[PDB]
């Protein structure tokens, strides 16, 4: 489950970065995401049955097991991106228009990143090496060999985009280890509170049928406690502060999203610049208003 949940996450991490890098380059400079993004969606669709909103992960595992043939699709994608990525960086590296319009725009250092809660490429561009996947390992990420792209002290529009390109290469590396080291065993935990329980047993065993009935009806009863898990998302550190009062529904679901903080730093980072600079900055910040407003 750890490796499956990492694999799906890195597929979507690439998908989001591709779109972000493509859009920035299209507007600021002069990298077709559609084609590469479709290949990812095809694997995700084969595994989840859906594209943008998989809703596959479950409390204790993933809704189903990997579909037979997933390895073939993944290998094909891991043999197509290598070259496509080479084209993505070359552009940014040699697009003088991009470099000229992006370098030294909306620049901020470590102090500004820390005071405004900036996380992700922005924080790393300031030179602070803080990636939750390495700082606070989760989902068995500690079992993967990858490097965190870090900047040199200045978080400008160009440095932010360049780190996102270097992240794609590291994500492809994790996806290769997932493909060659996919463990054999359960896709759902063997815990009384795994929801829903393995369907094959639910369809043939009364004890598992009873557990399923209640978990899909009144809901899974979570004992009273407070939990918190922060993860390195596609746009920065995203966390879920959950509070249970011992019921089948949350008493409080706090979702800390990186985009909300990145939009509050804009006034301090763009003051004194021109509107043209603001539009480039807005692009360099990988952000979606759904993450900001929730």
């Amino acid at each position: 489950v750890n490796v499956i949940r990492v694999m799906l996450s890195e597929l979507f991490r690439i998908n989001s970065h591709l779109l972000y890098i493509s859009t920035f380059i299209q507007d600021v400079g002069a990298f077709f995401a559609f084609t590469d993004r479709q290949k990812i969606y095809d694997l995700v669709e084969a595994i989840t049955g859906f594209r943008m909103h998989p809703a596959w992960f479950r409390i204790g595992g993933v809704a189903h097991d990997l579909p037979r043939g997933w390895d073939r699709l993944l290998r094909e994608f891991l043999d197509w991106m290598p070259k496509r990525l080479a084209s993505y960086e070359k552009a940014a590296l040699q697009n003088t228009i991009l470099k000229g319009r992006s370098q030294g725009v909306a620049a901020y250092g470590a102090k500004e990143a820390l005071e405004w809660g900036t996380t992700g490429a922005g924080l790393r561009a300031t030179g602070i090496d803080f990636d939750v996947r390495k700082a606070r390992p989760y989902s068995g990420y500690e079992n993967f060999d990858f490097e965190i792209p870090v900047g040199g002290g200045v978080s400008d529009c160009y440095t932010r985009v360049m780190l996102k390109v270097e992240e794609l290469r590291q994500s492809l590396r994790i996806l290769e280890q997932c493909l060659n080291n996919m463990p054999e065993g359960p896709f759902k935990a063997d815990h009384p509170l795994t929801t829903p329980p393995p369907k094959e047993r639910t369809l043939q065993h009364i004890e598992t049928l009873i557990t399923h009935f209640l978990q899909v009806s009144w809901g899974p009863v979570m004992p009273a406690n407070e939990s918190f898990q922060m993860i390195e998302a596609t746009k920065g550190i995203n966390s879920y502060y959950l509070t249970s009062d011992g019921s089948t529904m949350s008493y409080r679901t706090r979702v800390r999203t990186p985009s909300f903080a990145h939009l509050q730093q804009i006034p301090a980072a763009i003051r004194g610049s021109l509107v043209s600079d603001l539009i480039v900055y807005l692009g360099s910040i990988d952000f979606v208003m759904s993450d900001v407003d929730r």
Binding site: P192, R201, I206, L209, I210, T211, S217, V221
Partner: protein, 907 residues
Amino acid sequence: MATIHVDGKEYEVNGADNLLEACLSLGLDIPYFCWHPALGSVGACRQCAVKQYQNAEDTRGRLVMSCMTPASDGTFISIDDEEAKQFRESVVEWLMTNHPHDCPVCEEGGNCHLQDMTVMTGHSFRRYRFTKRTHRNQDLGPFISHEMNRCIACYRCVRYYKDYADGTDLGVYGAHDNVYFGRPEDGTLESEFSGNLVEICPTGVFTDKTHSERYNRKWDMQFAPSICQQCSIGCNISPGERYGELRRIENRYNGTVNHYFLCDRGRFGYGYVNLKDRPRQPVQRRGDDFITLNAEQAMQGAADILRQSKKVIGIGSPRASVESNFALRELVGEENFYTGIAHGEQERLQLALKVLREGGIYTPALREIESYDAVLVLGEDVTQTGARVALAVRQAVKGKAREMAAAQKVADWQIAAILNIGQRAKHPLFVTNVDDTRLDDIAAWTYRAPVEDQARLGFAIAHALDNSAPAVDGIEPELQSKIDVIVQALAGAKKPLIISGTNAGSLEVIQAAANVAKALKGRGADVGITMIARSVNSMGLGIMGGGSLEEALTELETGRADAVVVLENDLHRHASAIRVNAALAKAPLVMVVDHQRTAIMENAHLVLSAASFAESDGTVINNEGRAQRFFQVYDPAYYDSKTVMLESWRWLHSLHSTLLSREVDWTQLDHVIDAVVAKIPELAGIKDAAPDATFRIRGQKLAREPHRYSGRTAMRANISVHEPRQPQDIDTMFTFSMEGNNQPTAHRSQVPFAWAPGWNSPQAWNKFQDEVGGKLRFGDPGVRLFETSENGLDYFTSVPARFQPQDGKWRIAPYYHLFGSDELSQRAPVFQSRMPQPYIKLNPADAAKLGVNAGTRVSFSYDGNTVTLPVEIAEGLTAGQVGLPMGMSGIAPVLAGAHLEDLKEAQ
């Protein structure tokens, strides 16, 4: 009382309790099945296992059963001990070995204690690979369904049906793992309290067939705290609705009234609410043309005729609420308001009230009845009129065993021991009726005699207990000997209980009971008096008062009254149909406000579509004088927008406003309640019966729907894909939604339904009570309107003369049926089979004299009408008396005490 140590934490508990009861009452969760807060502890399923240590230094304790272990001081137990957890999971696994895979198709799914415990024990993996035992099911009648495959052998049904309800048709058969729980043969369960099995059984072996027809899961039910309307006991119920139809009636725990048990009439007699012939919109009769009007049009037009009416009289009903009856009284004037009851019935009801309100003797609550040590029932067939009181009398009779066991220092929860120590020993019980009663099995003596002779016995017992009491003449030496046994039993009792009522049809039987109770009070005894009425708000109408139906008819007959507004009353159950129909035909305007299609509606000029208890909110007063409020369960116009079924008080209040201001006023319930408390000081407690509509829990309204209610965006999609607006409630503190509060710790007393995380079964009431089996944590709902008076009434000196058979005349003796005597319950379709076939009962000798045998149809004339009925032979019935099923359509309850004339073989 005692200090226990559970999992290290220290707790103060009652040493007289068992660890299960104690820990459950502390909020600690221990799985269980065989134990029930009312059936005691037996130690069968072995599920409540807890590790017990001898001291604080013991590290190797023993697995004991919390239900069979005293909560003694210095007790060290652990529920989270690994061995205890493993054993508790193993017990569930053993029960799952032979358990059917029928969750999706069983009616306990989502309300099953077994499902709740499987999950609580954390057993989700099956290791058993062998075959599962199967059992063939049986027919148990029209109310309960059988599915023995889903059994776990906890023995709860047999312990409740036979050791608590004293039934004789349920039993345990077979041995080892082939134990079977059911009837000795296929047939209808005969216990009037058989329905409680559906909530007692922790699985789905016993289910409710009345619901199975239109079954829905508990999470999809809209529930509201309501009071049962089938008799005068006033049991708290939780009616549930889905798709605009009352689906099921469940028990609402009232630690002061019905606690955990209802009776079959209230649990399965609600189908009348789902009848499709019920009025739904206001309709006006123009000659032979019927016009459906709207609320506004109906009010304006009616007020126009009423404004030009010489005298508008109003007839109320014991079925209607206090607010509804009061609204009619204000609309027509107290001088023109008449209780739709016969003169005699009103006299008896008022006499019963005077005894309870001015007799100086305490009237016990339903649960308090189980604590008296001697009971005398004078003329009241409780089992068929106030069934829940009969169940309470049964528990009271079982007190001797409990007293005997306490002398041997046996714990109160050890039922098995108490029963063995007791044997056939019981507290004295004496019942009087015109014939056999269902309480004859536990009664020391049953006096079968005419109502007059039954009363003479009461006056006699009173004279023997106090010579100052009026003496009776003509008591034969044989009876005197029997009277002495009753006198010594009541005299020897420390807490005697006298029970009478208005169902006997005699004022003397109520006066006799008052004399006996006064006699025992004079001898310094904790005497109790209980009076059984006939309907949900009989006592409420009695307190309000008014003219009789006969007087109301006379007004219409002299022509002095031109308009009659009848409220929820058929009038044919209280007066002759010929007289009522003729009187209603001489009235220029006849308006009927009822929620059921009655006969008088046929010739009514206007019929207002009133709401039933399910679609209305109001206050009813029980036999003990407790004012209890019922709340609307669902909005009748949610699915069908055309429906205009409004509460009777709202209809009448708006009409009164349109009559005085030509403007409609649909007021809130609280305003009407405030009017009643101001105008009638006697009905003042009704204000404290329940909080107002402004009551909130931390800002939240109380909720009616469970938090997992489904279909919100699809239930009405057929009518319109556009979801309707949540029906709004301005009358109560309940929301017609899930956006409210139903916490087990909410500082309230009105609980719509019982649900707690991990407890989806009726066992969830345990989390809403101060102590399991006790009272609601923040008090039980309901207020007694009157307290025991400082002074009592003088002895009644009117002893009747002995009954004498008269050639030609045949005294009508009152036979009541739990299934058939009530008006609304008889309308329910599922009751048709349970209801008795029409009959007349005759003394064997009288039948021989009339040369008729069992089955012979006999013709007789009452109100100038020849009726034919099959003859049944009743040996207990005295000669000169005929038996008729009171309340059964045709036989009006008023016939009690009347006389038949030309009784002869038909054809």
